[PDB]
């Protein structure tokens with residue numbers, strides 16, 4: 001992979017692997033999520049991150065995901081090449097946004113798009129805080145100055161508020177616990193695992209007859225290595241809409257909330 | 266990736282991804298296992314197997330390849346961002362079955378950083394029964410294997426061919442209630458063979474993982490874990506640190522896997 005001519009975005013090509021595809025022989029939404037994750041880490045390395053700025057390291061601040069939104073039109077098939085272009089943008093004092101554009105390396109057509117909202121958090125106390133002006137100037141030089149949105153639209157799904165699932169849920173998957181493969185290099189649960197846990201409560205018949213088109217996911221708290229999760233789902237709706245909730249199996253502490261949209265094959 | 270000059274082995278280069286590494290920033294044994302799995306599929310496609318891996322007789326007989334044993338020995342785990350080259354090849358073991366070997370190398374230095382060997386057997390995809398490789402079903406794949414023996418683990422009396430005992434109750438360490446999610450399944454809805462590796466390692470205490478690097482792992486496959494099954498992972502220290510492992514269904518205690526791991530201090 002490499003940064004583009006202006007140095008304000010990053011591109012990378014990926015050949016789809018055998019173990020990365022589902023029953024329909026096309027990459028899963030978790031493979032896509034993992035691919036988005038890798039091109040973002042590679043874009044941070046290429047711009048000089050050893051990911052913390054000089055002021056973030058001095059103040060023990062880190063980037064944390066607050067929301068992830070993914071919309072897929074076509075899932076790349078096993079053996080195909082998918083090109084991903086990623087870029088970042090300052091959202092003033094709120095935080096940062098990272099966008100992605102998925103393209104077929106052969107046709108050049110857009111096959112998916114994703115957007116994420118990252119916020120500042122003290123690595124030690126776990127407390128969120130606004131982006132300080134000193135930190136902003138250190139990363140602004142790596143972002144396009146003019147707005148460049150993957151989801152530009154007037155009333156797009158990526159900026160819609162998500163409600164809290166009410167008990168009783170229609171469908172549920174209980175006792176979900178992470179294993180060492182679900183952890184990252186700093187021993188925290190990888191953000192993609194929560195996507196897989198949300199989808200576990202979707203009945204298999206829906207997965208067999210529908211393709212996942214849109215997924216919005218809000219991150220409220222992290223799941224510790226020794227935590228047990230409950231995944232809940234209720235149909236809210238040709239298209240099938242769902243409302244999801246991830247909560248700790250014991251106290252019912254909310255970990256995640258989101259929505260999925262599915263279309264018939 | 267591509268087949269070598271003779272067409273009797275296959276090579277592929279892999280750049281190590283951020284999410285593929287563990288706490289020490291080097292690829293995990295499951296990332297390596299997944300990499301071995303992909304280069305074997307790519308070697309089968311390049312030699313003429315359709316993406317619908319069976320020969321012309323296996324189709325009209327409903328026979329499929331199943332893993333009976335996996336053995337992996339790693340000297341150095343590739344770091345995040347590094348390039349690892351894998352050379353893979355197959356060999357007929359007469360009517361017992363087939364063997365697939367792998368050699369891992371540093372794309373920069375060229376030195377061997379790991380090696381693995383697997384034993385595959387014939388199985389009716391409907392009745393799950395075990396069969397010997399028939400003569401007609403051998404001549405069809407023998408043309409893709411080197412005729413002379415080429416072993417990744419040649420040494421007489423080596424770890425890859427040692428019999429594994431059954432763990433006796435009570436186990437020293439245990440991880441219970443392990444169930445697969447959709448990410449653990451393959452394209453044909455079966456549990457991917459790498460998931461069982463991760464489940465075996467779940468019973469290893471975290472302090473051992475933090476102070477040691479996994480050097481050798483031998484794993485025998487006895488039964489598949491269905492999508493709706495619950496697994497128990499058991500471990501007992503037998504000793505470098507050596508362990509004996511056992512995977513069994515949470516309910517009836519039906520054995521699904523057994524194996525060993527060998528670990529070195531960092």
Ligand SMILES: O=C(CCCc1ccccc1)N1CCOCC1
Nearest residue numbers: 040041043044051063088098142
């Ligand atoms: O996307 C982010 C946050 C912003 C980092 C950034 C990179 C390049 C230009 C401008 C800003 N991260 C990369 C990997 O995930 C953790 C941090």
Ligand SMILES: O=C(CCCc1ccccc1)N1CCOCC1
Nearest residue numbers: 305306308309312318330355409
């Ligand atoms: O290796 C095998 C079975 C033998 C297939 C083979 C490929 C190339 C040369 C000779 C034989 N498998 C790996 C791919 O998935 C199915 C099992």
